[PDB]
């Protein structure tokens, strides 16, 4: 027979009202798995358990992939933060922090302490007190740890202490510690660009992101002792508590000591695959982080629960029920996502020549269930219409409403931040990536913490089974909607609104661009060329038969590589890996061009005019070249005559 869509979402709900996620999240929180740093023994026992499950669910092929990396772990000596008097006589200590920061430096220093809000660059340039030569304190949240340490390194400070206030993070236990990686960029930093297998023989190298300054996480109650000695008031624009103070008194000054040692540990990745029936070699990757520093049920528990239950569900629907996919599906559990996601980045840098142009969507199940109120998504624009249709099918878990309440949601979507694990798929490799969370308005309090566990998780969310049912239902709609049909549901219309947003952002500086002696018109015509390419492609889907396969493969290959052609071909992938000109990092991306252009008006001398000429030429020709490559053969490009 055949199974169409409306039959098939019904079959998913009938498979989905039977499964139980709560028992599995208890299972990943037992005493045989509960502390699992990367490379530890409990990680390898969990990887044997998952790699047993992918065999028991009758997957088509299950395989393991291991490689050796360098992480940083605590030393046998303690690291402390300790108040030093001006006399040098009586020495008072505040905390021996249980939690540490990855990729910091082994050092020990003294000096003045200066409060900063979050370590935004705006904060450091809004400060009154000069920053240099002085240890700083910041509050965790709103930015990755590595960009706090990056800004505090650019302003020539020595030390960084990071804590959690009560206003942003309301908790009861003031004596609590946590964890974070400090590497700007991702991947294993001691092998950038090339993968960390055992064929490279590990040449000497180092990344660019690693700071040269000691970083340390302190608790709230440690921050109250330091704020007992400081003076000068926090300004009222900081939505903060009543205790924080700006700089130290002139007598006392703190002493930070941080002592961490490198380690070289073995990383396992477990995979299992479901084959396709029309085109088996094109596939779609579904992932989840397998470990976390503390007990870790919010970070890696719910991801591995959703992953195991989804692998059971689709293997059962293909084997027993009669569902027939057209493309393969890869389910994946990698470890070491907590050190800036090296388990995924070392895989992408491993096999990049084989999943060139083959893998067409990555899905992230990680951090799915945190809050119960809202629904937040972050994705490549190619997937937006897809998510829109899914928000018109799935019901809310708490109330009976649908998710599609706000009909204007494409602007509220924020781009993928670097601490997300779907970022090296989109920005480095060129795969359209999607992540989502049921998240409360304030972020989840104990998320990288020793108190992250199932007890306090079920205290926050009183109905976890229904919400996990909803999130697995949404990922089910994404996989089935991407795989059952001959037409991909990647919507290439969506980059056009991004381009209109960019050139519209450049029209307000046409007055400064006209003073340099160079015009802007070729970039308008580049936007227009991308419009006519997408419109021509839509009409060519209009005239194609649907049952025919040879005339739909030639139109699907043009859809698959509209994401690859926005990667810049004019940069080196070792010197800067994230090459997506929209959503990247460096001097080549398009908001880097805007952020170069607005500094000309202030007339400091920080603008670099030759750099702006090269950035305009390379951005204009990258967008124009994607617009050539989306529309037709070579001879059907119309030239300027």
């Amino acid at each position: 027979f055949r199974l169409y869509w409306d039959d098939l979402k019904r079959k998913l709900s009938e498979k989905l009202d039977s499964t139980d996620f709560t028992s599995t999240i208890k299972l990943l929180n037992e005493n045989s798995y509960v502390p699992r740093e990367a490379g530890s023994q409990k990680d390898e026992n969990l990887a044997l358990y998952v790699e047993n499950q992918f065999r028991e669910f009758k997957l088509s092929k299950v395989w393991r992939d291991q490689h050796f990396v360098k992480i940083q772990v605590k030393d046998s000596a303690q690291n402390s933060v300790i108040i030093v008097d001006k006399n040098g006589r009586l020495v008072y200590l505040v905390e021996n922090p249980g939690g540490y920061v990855a990729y910091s430096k082994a050092a020990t220093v003294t000096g003045k302490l200066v409060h900063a809000n979050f370590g935004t660059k705006k904060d450091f340039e809004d400060l009154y007190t000069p920053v240099n030569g002085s240890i700083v304190i910041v509050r965790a949240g709103k930015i990755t740890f590595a960009e706090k340490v990056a800004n505090a390194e650019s302003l020539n400070a020595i030390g960084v202490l990071i804590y959690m206030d009560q206003t942003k993070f309301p908790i009861v236990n003031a004596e609590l510690s946590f964890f974070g990686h400090a590497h700007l960029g991702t991947g294993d930093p001691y092998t950038p660009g090339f993968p960390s297998f055992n064929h490279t023989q590990f040449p000497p190298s180092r990344s660019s992101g690693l700071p040269n300054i000691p970083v340390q996480t302190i608790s709230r109650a440690a921050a109250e002792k330091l704020f007992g000695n400081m003076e000068g008031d926090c300004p009222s624009d900081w939505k903060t508590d009543s205790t924080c103070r700006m700089v130290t008194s002139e007598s006392k000054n703190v002493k930070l000591t941080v002592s961490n040692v490198l380690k070289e540990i073995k990383i396992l990745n477990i995979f299992g695959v479901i084959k396709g029936f029309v085109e088996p070699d094109h596939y779609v990757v579904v992932g989840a982080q397998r470990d976390a520093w503390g007990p870790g049920a919010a970070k890696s528990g719910v991801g591995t629960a959703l992953l195991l239950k989804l692998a059971q569900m689709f293997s059962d629907m293909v084997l027993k029920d009669g569902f027939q996919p057209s493309r393969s599906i890869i389910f994946a559990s990698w470890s070491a996502g907590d050190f800036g996601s090296v388990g995924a980045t070392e895989w992408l840098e491993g096999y990049l020549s084989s999943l060139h142009l083959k893998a067409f969507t990555y899905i992230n199940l990680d951090k799915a269930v945190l809050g119960t109120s809202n629904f937040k998504v972050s994705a490549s624009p190619l997937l937006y219409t897809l998510i829109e249709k899914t928000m018109q099918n799935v019901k809310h878990p708490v109330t009976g409403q649908f998710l599609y309440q706000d009909s204007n949601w494409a602007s509220k979507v924020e781009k993928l931040t670097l601490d997300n694990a779907a970022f090296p798929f989109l920005a480095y490799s060129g795969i359209p990536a999607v992540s989502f969370c049921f998240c409360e308005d304030t972020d989840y309090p104990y998320l990288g913490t020793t108190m992250d566990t199932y007890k306090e998780l079920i205290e926050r969310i009183p109905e976890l089974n229904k919400v996990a049912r909803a999130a697995a239902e949404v990922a089910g709609q994404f996989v089935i909607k991407l795989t059952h049909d001959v037409e991909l549901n990647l919507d290439y219309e969506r980059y056009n609104s991004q381009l209109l947003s960019f050139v519209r952002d450049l029209n307000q500086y046409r007055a400064d661009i006209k003073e340099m002696g160079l015009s802007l018109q070729w970039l308008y015509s580049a936007r227009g060329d991308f419009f006519r390419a997408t419109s021509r492609l839509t009409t060519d889907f209009g005239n194609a038969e649907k049952t025919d396969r040879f005339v739909m493969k030639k139109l699907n290959d043009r859809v698959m590589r509209v994401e690859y052609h926005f990667l810049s071909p004019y940069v080196s992938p070792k010197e800067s890996p994230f090459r997506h000109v929209f959503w990247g990092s460096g001097s080549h991306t398009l908001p880097a061009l805007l952020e170069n252009l607005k500094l000309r008006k202030q007339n400091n001398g920080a603008f670099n005019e030759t750099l702006f000429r090269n950035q305009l030429a390379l951005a204009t020709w990258t967008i124009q070249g994607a617009a050539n490559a989306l529309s037709g053969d070579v001879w059907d490009i119309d030239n300027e005559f």
Binding site: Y4, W5, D6, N543, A544, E545, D548, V551
Partner: protein, 87 residues
Amino acid sequence: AYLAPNNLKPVVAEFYGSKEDPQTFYYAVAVVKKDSGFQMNQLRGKKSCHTGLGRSAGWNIPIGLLYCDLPEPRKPLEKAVANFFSG
């Protein structure tokens, strides 16, 4: 017929009226039996005979009038029409 990979084109049309006043369109009608007493509205579950799948007066206009009166799943169309018309 003009969809890729067929790529065809009408070359010669034909006219239907008398010779002196040529007519290039043809009306579409729905024949019933007398004294059955069902309207266009109360047509549900009655048997019907078409002239083919995809032809103009047979499939596209009669189903084209009433396809939105059917309940979803809308596509594939022959399934929901198969559950609208009994036999």
